[model samples]
Target: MVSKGEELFTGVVPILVELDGDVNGHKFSVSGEGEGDATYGKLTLKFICTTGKLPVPWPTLVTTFVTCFARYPDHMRQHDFFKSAMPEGYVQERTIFFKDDGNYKTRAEVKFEGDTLVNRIELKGIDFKEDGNILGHKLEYNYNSHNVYIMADKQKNGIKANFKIRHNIEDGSVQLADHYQQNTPIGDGPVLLPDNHYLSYQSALSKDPNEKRDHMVLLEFVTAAGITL
Candidate 1:
């Protein structure tokens, strides 16, 4: 079991006046510390404001923690969080941002064979807080189904990539899983899931023989928060 002081995710997040109710642009700071369990997919995060005061509510503060880590995909993959086993082959540098209002934007780029494929997806919807046994697999942790969008090209047949970031419930470990699919499956039949449960996402996303996913875990602890939020 990972100790409390050993947080998998830690970062200094800037409190933006645009998002927060504060008047200052970037004076305030919120340092976040998070840990996840790999066994049961459990996650715990705590945020401490420099001034012991946060402008926005708690929900927005949670989004701030997500946005801070979402931009650093490379750093996230370095840990033992992900349960998938596909190679990330070659990934192009891209930044992802999740807004306070449940909006998000990101670009996907990958190098396959000798081709460079690219796509971008953004959404303005809210994530569904769902909990149940999906197919035969169990919903081990409290998850928000952000049925996020993956941009596709109509001009040409190109491959696109999508990612899901989830936390563990048992061991307090975090994970990042990648999914690659061809053209989107429109009006498909009911999909079956894996029994191991973590494997469910691999089949749920795509079934191409060449379909690949990279399951990675947290690399190191960045900062330690004194209390849980």
Candidate 2:
């Protein structure tokens, strides 16, 4: 049986937000359980913004909300993406803002499960122009402790030879993991970012019987606003 403390640690928390009459003034509110578990968890977030007589553009407002929400744990706020283990504390509050006749208000909530350590976030009561569009976007990342590394191919060394690899492991006997590679476009062209031009192996496993198991590299690029390329 789950105790009250345990139940609180794993159950969902309701989030609410209120906006002023216009679309400029904003207020945010959030509530949710802290981090724990390993495989599954849940979270909820909301936002609201009230404005004055100024014409509030829905596109710009939605864009800003989406951008900030997507980048919250990564860029909008500095969050450690590489760390695998969940920290013990109240997770950040997710929020939403809505514009009323003259003011705006925002609210957000997050929930989690201890077993799977998955988080479910939800935002409600916000109005959008499109009916078929998703109500709000969802993003998740693994917090389970694991070994990871960051590597890149440098331009000065040529495609075949100019590669740099950095990792947390220092075992001398450890060999590079077998990985598959794919080529992709970077920006407009000409000027290429090493991290932008590559999509490396993700959870790749070596078929060679004699080789030791190696770390899998799931290479992906994220735009400034946290959009994946």
Taking all chains together, each candidate's TM-score versus the true structure is 0.26, 0.19
For model 2, residues 9-98, the per-residue Cα lDDT tens digits are 333333222222222222222222222221122222222222222133222222112111111222212221111112221122222322
Residue 207's lDDT within candidate 2 is 26
Model 1 agreement with the true structure over 92-177: per-residue lDDT tens digits? 22222221112222222221122211112221222311231111122232333433233333332222335554523344543332
Instruction: Candidate 1: give its CA RMSD in angstroms.
Output: 18.5
**lDDT (0-100) at residue 65 of candidate 1?**
31
